[PDB]
């Protein structure tokens, strides 16, 4: 048969890739960062509590000014909060209640949310009529959206449960690039700091490094034995971290093209819903569904701190661009902002 | 302190809170029914009987009660990733075609779906309203074809009533916690106006249990 020898060539390529990438594995990141002093106990207290949602929050996102944050919950509301004065700047009602992602534009003029309606809706915040209205609805993406993320005011990358990611042009409304190659549902997405490449973590327990320009998978990463729910670049743009339902986070580097560190603990048997790094990337903040967050020392895999202020599943978290705050939304309708 | 603009910002935020409480108490006084079941099982018959591209929402009013049915089966993905979004529905309207037993092991696939939904961790106490559809088709089909090719351990008369009660007994016995949740089995005709009445009567028990949970009495 021709398909059987073609699968033979595929597994031979996979064996050559695994041998070529263990040939560049000489020393673990534990063996390099064992002389490094640890960060000690990270004590972060809850500085704000944002209380306006009346249902489970699935998504927050910070602004680039580190003061405004958008928040999405199942009551059909996304609220834009002033994080300093605890005020509500905007309350935007959603055309579908089932919303599992939200993003805030890096200019700040737009928010965009999506869910089970299969549509990333984009809302113009800064209108001469004074209200927030829908600018575009990006239809045609045939699965629930898991994560949409802005590049500009005109470009946005969506991930979905039809195993695809996409690059859209907002003003024309039609998607310009489709990133295919996962076999499970793409659950999370994270853009690089230069935004010329991104990572997608999916339900086939593999994270793929995409490339926004030509539109195809540059590197592929395995190592999780369960479905990946969270993904986040390192601030250098060279590493990234995955979080999944086998209770481990994992660190991958793009140039070494392999696993470096597993953030696991035998007390933790629960899933991971959200990860983020700090500003220097020394702290990896993973939100779990044993109702709290852990702050891992990302170079030594100690568990440096526990953010334990929620009475349901931590579903989303985000660190500011300043690094001055961490917000943590959850399924008990409360954002907590920690410092 | 607060300047003259921060006071108006706080006043705007308070008025936004009043609109949020109004909308939240408007949506809290409403019944949310998750419509489920395998494909070609008369869910279209159900949504034309209550009222007359990922998730289809239907709003109807019956006896001073507002119902929202969510037909989520139009979109296909891994169900475990989005099934927690419907934790907190009032009832799960499951639909099973009775006359889809001799076609292809489709009744075994709908039993697989009922075992997945009914023993789920998110619907561990959510009541299920089970609608057995196409019962006139089941009546005209059970004379020529036997129920042995769907259920090999079935021993009984090949009439409507004993085999339909057997299919009920099989579907009732998929749950592992009979004491925790209720299953309300009904049979739809080709056309009858009593299915929304059955939904309303099963929802009234869930409303009574939620009112007792609201008053601390559980």
């Amino acid at each position: 048969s021709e398909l059987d020898q073609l699968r033979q060539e595929a597994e031979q390529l996979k064996n050559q890739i695994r041998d070529a990438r263990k040939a560049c594995a000489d020393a673990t990141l534990s063996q390099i960062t064992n002389n490094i002093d640890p960060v000690g106990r990270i004590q972060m207290r809850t500085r704000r509590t944002l209380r306006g949602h009346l249902a489970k929050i699935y998504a927050m996102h910070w602004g680039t000014d580190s003061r405004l944050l958008v928040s999405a919950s199942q009551d059909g509301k996304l609220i834009i909060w002033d994080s300093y004065t605890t005020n509500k700047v905007h309350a935007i009602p959603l055309r579908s209640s089932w919303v599992m992602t939200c993003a805030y534009a890096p200019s700040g003029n737009y928010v965009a949310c999506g869910g089970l309606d299969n549509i990333c809706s984009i809302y113009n915040l800064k209108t001469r009529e004074g209200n927030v209205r829908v600018s575009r609805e990006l239809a045609g993406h045939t699965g629930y959206l898991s994560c949409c993320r802005f590049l500009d005011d005109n470009q946005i990358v969506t991930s979905s449960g039809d195993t695809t990611c996409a690059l859209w042009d907002i003003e024309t409304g039609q998607q310009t690039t489709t990133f295919t190659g996962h076999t499970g549902d793409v659950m999370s997405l994270s853009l690089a700091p230069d935004t010329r490449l991104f990572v997608s973590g999916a339900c086939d327990a593999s994270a793929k490094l995409w490339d926004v320009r030509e539109g195809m998978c540059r590197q592929t990463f395995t190592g999780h034995e369960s479905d990946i729910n969270a993904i986040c670049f390192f601030p250098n743009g060279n590493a990234f971290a995955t979080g999944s339902d086998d209770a481990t986070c994992r660190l991958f580097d793009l140039r070494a093209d392999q696993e470096l560190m597993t953030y696991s603990h035998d007390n933790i048997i629960c899933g991971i819903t959200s990860v983020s790094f700090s500003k220097s990337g020394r702290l990896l903040l993973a939100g779990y569904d044993d109702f709290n967050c852990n702050v891992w020392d990302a170079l030594k895999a100690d568990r440096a701190g526990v953010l334990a202020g929620h009475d349901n599943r931590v579903s989303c978290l985000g660190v500011t661009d300043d690094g001055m705050a961490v917000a943590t939304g959850s399924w008990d309708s409360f954002l907590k902002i920690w410092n | 302190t607060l300047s003259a603009e921060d006071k108006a910002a706080v006043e705007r935020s308070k008025m936004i809170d009043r609109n949020l409480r109004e909308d939240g108490e408007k949506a809290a006084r409403e019944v949310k029914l998750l419509l489920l079941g395998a494909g070609e099982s008369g869910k279209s018959t159900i949504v034309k009987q209550m009222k007359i591209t990922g998730i289809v929402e239907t709003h109807f009013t019956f006896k001073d009660l507002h119902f929202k049915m969510f037909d989520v089966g139009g979109q296909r993905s891994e169900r475990k990733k989005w099934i927690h979004c419907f934790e907190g529905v009032t009832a799960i309207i499951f639909c099973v075609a009775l006359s889809d037993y001799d076609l292809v092991n489709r009744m075994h696939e709908s039993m697989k779906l009922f075992d997945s939904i009914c023993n789920n961790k998110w619907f561990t106490d959510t009541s299920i309203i089970l609608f057995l559809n196409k019962k006139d088709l089941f009546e005209e089909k059970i004379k020529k074809s036997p129920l042995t090719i769907c259920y090999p351990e079935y021993a009984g008369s090949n009439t409507y009533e004993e085999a339909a009660a057997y299919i009920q007994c099989q579907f009732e016995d998929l749950n592992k916690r009979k004491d925790t949740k209720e299953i309300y089995t009904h049979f739809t005709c080709a056309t009858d106006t009593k299915n929304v009445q059955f939904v309303f009567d099963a929802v009234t028990d869930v409303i009574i249990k939620n009112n007792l949970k609201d008053c601390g009495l559980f």
Partner: single-chain antibody
Amino acid sequence: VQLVESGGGLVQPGGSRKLSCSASGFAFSSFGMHWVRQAPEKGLEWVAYISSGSGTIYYADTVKGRFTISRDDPKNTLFLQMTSLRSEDTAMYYCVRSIYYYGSSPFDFWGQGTTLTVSDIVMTQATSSVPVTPGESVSISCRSSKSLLHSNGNTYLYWFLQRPGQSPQLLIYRMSNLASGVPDRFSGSGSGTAFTLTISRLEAEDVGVYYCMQHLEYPLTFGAGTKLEL
């Protein structure tokens, strides 16, 4: 976005008059309204303010007791009931929308004004007239009597331009931020009680009177008016 006012005319002193303003094309219930008047050859003088949803109503000390500002949101209309009018109430009355949240731009749209004819913190714009050549750069300063820098970091100074024969128009909100529809050739700077508006590379249709206003506390007070001429 359109605020058009009506209800002006001649009132015999001692009499009464209701001024009305109809709004068109913006979410009128989300906006606070101000009435700011202007005497026939004087500057702008703020009269009254009703909030969004009518929750907070302020007045000027010279009109307090005799004037009542009242909005009605389904008709999208604003009223000012004016009782026992004196001869210093002869003015042109302007309705102003202003919305207040983080990063907002209040006082951004002004109405066309009606002519009434009746038969704190001070702002000193020290220069009343500037001889201007087009193409050049013009700096316009004004003085406050109190530090306009609040503890939150905002220094609430507002620069308006009134082109001749028209309504005034927001150039800069909170001493440094350009309004929408305002070019980058306008810029503002300052410290507490000392501010300046610079116009680099001045062209025509910048001729007019420039007013600086405080929004630190009520009553809102304008400058006397710095006027450019070509």
